[PDB]
Design a protein around this ligand. Sequence first.
Ligand SMILES: CC(C)CCC[C@@H](C)[C@H]1CC[C@H]2[C@@H]3CC=C4C[C@@H](OC(=O)CCC(=O)O)CC[C@]4(C)[C@H]3CC[C@]12C
Ligand SMILES: CC(C)CCC[C@@H](C)[C@H]1CC[C@H]2[C@@H]3CC=C4C[C@@H](OC(=O)CCC(=O)O)CC[C@]4(C)[C@H]3CC[C@]12C
Ligand SMILES: CC(C)CCC[C@@H](C)[C@H]1CC[C@H]2[C@@H]3CC=C4C[C@@H](OC(=O)CCC(=O)O)CC[C@]4(C)[C@H]3CC[C@]12C
Ligand SMILES: CC(C)CCC[C@@H](C)[C@H]1CC[C@H]2[C@@H]3CC=C4C[C@@H](OC(=O)CCC(=O)O)CC[C@]4(C)[C@H]3CC[C@]12C
Ligand SMILES: CC(C)CCC[C@@H](C)[C@H]1CC[C@H]2[C@@H]3CC=C4C[C@@H](OC(=O)CCC(=O)O)CC[C@]4(C)[C@H]3CC[C@]12C
Ligand SMILES: CC(C)CCC[C@@H](C)[C@H]1CC[C@H]2[C@@H]3CC=C4C[C@@H](OC(=O)CCC(=O)O)CC[C@]4(C)[C@H]3CC[C@]12C
Ligand SMILES: CC(C)CCC[C@@H](C)[C@H]1CC[C@H]2[C@@H]3CC=C4C[C@@H](OC(=O)CCC(=O)O)CC[C@]4(C)[C@H]3CC[C@]12C
Ligand SMILES: CC(C)CCC[C@@H](C)[C@H]1CC[C@H]2[C@@H]3CC=C4C[C@@H](OC(=O)CCC(=O)O)CC[C@]4(C)[C@H]3CC[C@]12C
Ligand SMILES: CC(C)CCC[C@@H](C)[C@H]1CC[C@H]2[C@@H]3CC=C4C[C@@H](OC(=O)CCC(=O)O)CC[C@]4(C)[C@H]3CC[C@]12C
Ligand SMILES: Cc1cccc(COc2ccccc2C(=O)N(CCCN)Cc2cccs2)c1
Lengths: 40, 554, 142
Amino acid sequence: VKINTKANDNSEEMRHRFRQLDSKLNDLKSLLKEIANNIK
Amino acid sequence: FSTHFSTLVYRNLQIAKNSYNDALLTFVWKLVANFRRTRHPLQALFIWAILQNKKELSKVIWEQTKGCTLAALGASKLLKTLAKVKNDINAAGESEELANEYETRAVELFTECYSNDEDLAEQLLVYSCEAWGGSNCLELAVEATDQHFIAQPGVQNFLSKQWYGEISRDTKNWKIILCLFIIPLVGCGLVSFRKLWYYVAFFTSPFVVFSWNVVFYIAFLLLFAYVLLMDFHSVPHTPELILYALVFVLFCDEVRQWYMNGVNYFTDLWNVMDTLGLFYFIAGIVFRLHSSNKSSLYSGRVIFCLDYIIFTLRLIHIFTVSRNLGPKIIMLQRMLIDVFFFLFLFAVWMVAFGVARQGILRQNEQRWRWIFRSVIYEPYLAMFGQVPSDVDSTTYDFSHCTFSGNESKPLCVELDEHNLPRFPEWITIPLVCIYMLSTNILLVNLLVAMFGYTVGIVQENNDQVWKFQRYFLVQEYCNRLNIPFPFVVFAYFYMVVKKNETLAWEGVMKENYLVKINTKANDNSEEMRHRFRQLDSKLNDLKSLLKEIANNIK
Amino acid sequence: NLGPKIIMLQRMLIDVFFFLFLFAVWMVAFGVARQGILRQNEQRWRWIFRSVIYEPYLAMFGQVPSDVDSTTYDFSHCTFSGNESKPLCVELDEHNLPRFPEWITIPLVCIYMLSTNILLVNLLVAMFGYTVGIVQENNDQV
Ligand SMILES: CC(C)CCC[C@@H](C)[C@H]1CC[C@H]2[C@@H]3CC=C4C[C@@H](OC(=O)CCC(=O)O)CC[C@]4(C)[C@H]3CC[C@]12C
Ligand SMILES: CC(C)CCC[C@@H](C)[C@H]1CC[C@H]2[C@@H]3CC=C4C[C@@H](OC(=O)CCC(=O)O)CC[C@]4(C)[C@H]3CC[C@]12C
Ligand SMILES: CC(C)CCC[C@@H](C)[C@H]1CC[C@H]2[C@@H]3CC=C4C[C@@H](OC(=O)CCC(=O)O)CC[C@]4(C)[C@H]3CC[C@]12C
Ligand SMILES: CC(C)CCC[C@@H](C)[C@H]1CC[C@H]2[C@@H]3CC=C4C[C@@H](OC(=O)CCC(=O)O)CC[C@]4(C)[C@H]3CC[C@]12C
Ligand SMILES: CC(C)CCC[C@@H](C)[C@H]1CC[C@H]2[C@@H]3CC=C4C[C@@H](OC(=O)CCC(=O)O)CC[C@]4(C)[C@H]3CC[C@]12C
Ligand SMILES: CC(C)CCC[C@@H](C)[C@H]1CC[C@H]2[C@@H]3CC=C4C[C@@H](OC(=O)CCC(=O)O)CC[C@]4(C)[C@H]3CC[C@]12C
Ligand SMILES: CC(C)CCC[C@@H](C)[C@H]1CC[C@H]2[C@@H]3CC=C4C[C@@H](OC(=O)CCC(=O)O)CC[C@]4(C)[C@H]3CC[C@]12C
Ligand SMILES: CC(C)CCC[C@@H](C)[C@H]1CC[C@H]2[C@@H]3CC=C4C[C@@H](OC(=O)CCC(=O)O)CC[C@]4(C)[C@H]3CC[C@]12C
Ligand SMILES: CC(C)CCC[C@@H](C)[C@H]1CC[C@H]2[C@@H]3CC=C4C[C@@H](OC(=O)CCC(=O)O)CC[C@]4(C)[C@H]3CC[C@]12C
Ligand SMILES: Cc1cccc(COc2ccccc2C(=O)N(CCCN)Cc2cccs2)c1
């Protein structure tokens, strides 16, 4: 477990979090587009 | 080649070829002259681009040539020789850097090749050149003193396999050395032949020939010493005739070396030493044959003694391949400057002290031998811990000195009106004390410190130089008849009386090496910014589409 | 306290062997040359080795071989024949004067002393210093 923690201490998860946020934003944009299409 | 070839570069190349010349310079010069006035067009283009200092274009052209290691080695040699003639300071760095870069490229490519298949790598190494420069990779690296390429594990392993010959490289040295003495032990399984026929295989190995030559040289030295010390008479006896016979074959080998090579053969120090030793031996024989006159015999004996010193000092050179003493012997020649500095300081102090003491003790010696004896020899002996003496009146005695120069004794000290010595001790004694302090202690300790620093500094690359010299010696031994020294005269007399899969594999490994370099460069892992920019552009496009949809709705 | 140093002691054989090799080469050369140019046909092995090896060996410790200069040479210690247990007398010429020239013997001994007593010992000191510096890293482990 200590070896695994030392390996994971890279702290590169920021890129993964940013990618997840971008995917969520894309999903929100798609939902907004669908709502706009439904309105018209 | 006719028009786009730079005129300045053309003139410089012409001057270098006409002035220095070399096995490769002549070839490139002739090719350039022919084109201006196997065809190998890629090699010609590579040379044209490299002679004009086009690093990137030269690298691009290099990736297309079939023989890449040989081309890189030739390029490094060409750049080094061109820089050796250049006078501009700025270009001297650029040419050296480019040559080093190409040498590194060749080293890396050969390391990649050897790690895949040793046999094919060795075949490529021995692969003869198709008139690229008239030589293969090893010869070009040697002529370009590319020590890195010769010091890498693959070339050293190849040289070791060639050196041990048929005998397996994984054979204990002591076992083979023991088997050398007792012949019948070779039949037994003590010695391997992994690589009757066994005898020929054992005796054709240059290792065994070298060992036998060492044994015979030691025996020759023993015989020489015995003749000098115990069996020297007016008329030479059988042992001295045997000694002359043994020297004759060495003289014949020296003449053969003079014939194969030329005046360049005398550039090396040890060849000069050998020639001087042989000439001294001949002069000693000439003096000795005058049995009637004893003075000639004594002169011949002295000449033989000096020649014996010369012969004996060569063991240091011959034993520079043992792999334990070799590196230290190689480093030995790296400490001349410290010795010269020490000798300079010591000589200055010696002259000053000797002249002062002789002047303040004795007047008008008029004999040169005693002048130098008192001025140089006695102060020189102080280096080893003995005081010059004669500086204090108490220990001085008049029995050893002579008032006149008729006898072979030092001149007596100047005496005053009362027949007492005239020199004052209160300046002589401090003088000798200061001289001893300066010479015996400070200088020796300073020399020790300088030797320590030099040893520390030069240990980094000593093994590389030793490996280069090992290659030289191994090639020298393999090049000659490869016969034991005492039995080479027969070979001389008889010979006088009577007398591309590899390139494709190299290209594939070159492509693999280029791909590896590209991967190493791309390992930066900076693509995250590009991915983020692409995501931002996609988001902007989605926003524009949403705005268009909203506009369409209203 | 002494253990690590004793352990490191066995790490300096190669330097000693190199020093002994060079010293032996020089010793043999100088001894043979001097014996040949001073005396002829000793015929006794013990004195041969005494003059060729032992006396030059003593030069390692700072004493000059001697017998190279005619001034200090005396005939009392030497014997013309080998009956006695003394070194053989130097070869004499027609006028009963020693025959060897000093202008080659003296430089020979000076060069030998310079090469052996000073250069070799200092080189050994330097090699010992380097070896001590290098091997101190893992001596405690051994
Ligand atoms: C005939 C009598 C008077 C001579 C006896 C003296 C021995 C001490 C000499 C004779 C031959 C010598 C050997 C001749 C050949 C070699 C091989 C040499 O080792 C290598 O060649 C290493 C090569 C490498 O791998 O680089 C070291 C010296 C050695 C053992 C010599 C060591 C000393 C020996 C045994
Ligand atoms: C003016 C008078 C005093 C004449 C003096 C001449 C000597 C100083 C010459 C004669 C023989 C020479 C030597 C022959 C052999 C050697 C060993 C050699 O040692 C090495 O080079 C070690 C490195 C290697 O050879 O691989 C260096 C030159 C030296 C001392 C030579 C240079 C100096 C010597 C003693
Ligand atoms: C006494 C007089 C009348 C004759 C002169 C004798 C010398 C010419 C001989 C006697 C023994 C020989 C030595 C026997 C053993 C060795 C060790 C040898 O060094 C090695 O074995 C290195 C091997 C390695 O490094 O592994 C070099 C030669 C040497 C000094 C030999 C060189 C010449 C010596 C001193
Ligand atoms: C650090 C180094 C360079 C200094 C050397 C220290 C001592 C070895 C020297 C310094 C001054 C010297 C002294 C200078 C003068 C004399 C008088 C001299 O006797 C005389 O006066 C000679 C005339 C006479 O009276 O007969 C005997 C030596 C002595 C004590 C010298 C002996 C050694 C001394 C103490
Ligand atoms: C009455 C007193 C105050 C006079 C000064 C006493 C000391 C300061 C003197 C006496 C002897 C001198 C020394 C005599 C010889 C030398 C070697 C000399 O070395 C060199 O300059 C290069 C040559 C070499 O290294 O041997 C340096 C100074 C030193 C130590 C001298 C420096 C000053 C010393 C110690
Ligand atoms: C005089 C003749 C007739 C008899 C021979 C006497 C020696 C056998 C004895 C006398 C005193 C002894 C020594 C007394 C003290 C010491 C120090 C001792 O070293 C330590 O104490 C190391 C301890 C540490 O490292 O902390 C090793 C033995 C030694 C040299 C002893 C070893 C043997 C010696 C020299
Ligand atoms: C041919 C003639 C001249 C015979 C010469 C034999 C000697 C050279 C032998 C006899 C006793 C030996 C010694 C017995 C004890 C020691 C101490 C020993 O020192 C160490 O190993 C220190 C490291 C440790 O022991 O932990 C090394 C071997 C040595 C010198 C031995 C090797 C050499 C000696 C003096
Ligand atoms: C740096 C080292 C290796 C060089 C040694 C320096 C001096 C110690 C040597 C160099 C040349 C030698 C000289 C060479 C020749 C002679 C003549 C010699 O006297 C003779 O001529 C003997 C015959 C006679 O006249 O009776 C006395 C020694 C001397 C001055 C030698 C004494 C010491 C000298 C100056
Ligand atoms: C008339 C003049 C111009 C002749 C040359 C004078 C000096 C350059 C000679 C005289 C004595 C020579 C020295 C005599 C002995 C040695 C030991 C020798 O050492 C070795 O090669 C290995 C053996 C060892 O280290 O002792 C190196 C050269 C050196 C300093 C010789 C180098 C050249 C020296 C200083
Ligand atoms: C003073 C003097 C003069 C000539 C020869 C020597 C002994 O030199 C060696 C001793 C042992 C092993 C090899 C050598 C050595 O290199 N040659 C080549 C010399 C190149 N000029 C001598 C050899 C003859 C046959 C095989 S080897 C010494």
